[PDB]
Design a protein around this ligand. Structure first.
Ligand code: BRT
Length: 223
């Protein structure tokens, strides 16, 4: 069982005040991330091809480019596990975060696609989570959820040994049209969204509500 807390160790950069500076530096950093992360490089190359195929479909916000589209696609792929891990364990080993540009492009993609809408989403896990007992909570790492309770409860993500999160998010973004799995009806939640209302329901259900944006512990770290 894992604890549901404020994720004090997670890299949670919101890039406040350095968007343009990161835009300029991220291309070089992306290349550095690849040199330090061969798997990431493979995952990005795969995502780039998928993105080249899907983008002609619709339009995107002002400023949204191939880096943002490819990062989102790539997140719905195999690189997710390691990336979420690195983000989660950031404070414990800062010199091993080989996702400097990746994290930026993914964060910015979510920021660009976000409007003020809130969604009712669900997230299932194989690992049981326990609320610490006090204070608001945060996931820290980017967090996948679904509009479909059936998807979140599916054998793919959930089990009686884990937890089903029932969530009301207002920073989450519907990214179905980017995913390698459109069927999952995914809503991607930034790790910096805080839930001021936490209620445990039964042994495997946790209700998260009263979502709020909250200043991060890290800001423009690699700018
Ligand atoms: N853990 C989950 O419920 C989940 C994880 N990834 C995508 C989607 Br949709 C859901």
């Amino acid at each position: 069982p894992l604890m549901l807390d404020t994720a004090p160790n997670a890299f949670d950069d919101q890039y406040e005040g350095c968007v343009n500076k990161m835009e300029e530096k991220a291309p070089l950093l992306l290349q550095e991330d690849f040199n330090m992360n061969a798997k990431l490089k493979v995952a990005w190359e795969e995502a780039k091809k998928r993105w080249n195929n899907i983008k002609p479909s619709r339009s995107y916000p002002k400023g949204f480019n191939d880096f943002h589209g490819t990062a989102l696609v790539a997140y719905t792929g195999s690189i997710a596990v390691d990336f979420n891990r690195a983000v989660r364990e950031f404070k414990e080993n800062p010199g091993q975060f080989h996702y400097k540009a990746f994290h930026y492009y993914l964060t910015r993609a979510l920021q660009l696609l976000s409007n003020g809408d809130c969604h009712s989403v669900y997230r299932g896990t194989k690992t049981r989570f326990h609320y610490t007992g006090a204070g608001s909570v945060r996931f820290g790492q980017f967090t996948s959820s679904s509009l479909s309770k059936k998807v979140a409860q599916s054998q793919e993500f959930f089990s009686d040994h884990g937890t089903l999160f029932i969530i009301k998010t207002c920073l989450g973004v519907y990214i179905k049209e980017f995913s390698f799995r459109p069927d999952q009806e995914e809503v991607l939640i930034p790790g910096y969204e805080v839930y001021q209302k936490v209620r445990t329901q039964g042994y495997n259900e946790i209700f998260l509500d009263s979502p709020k944006r909250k200043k991060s512990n890290y800001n423009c770290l690699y700018s």
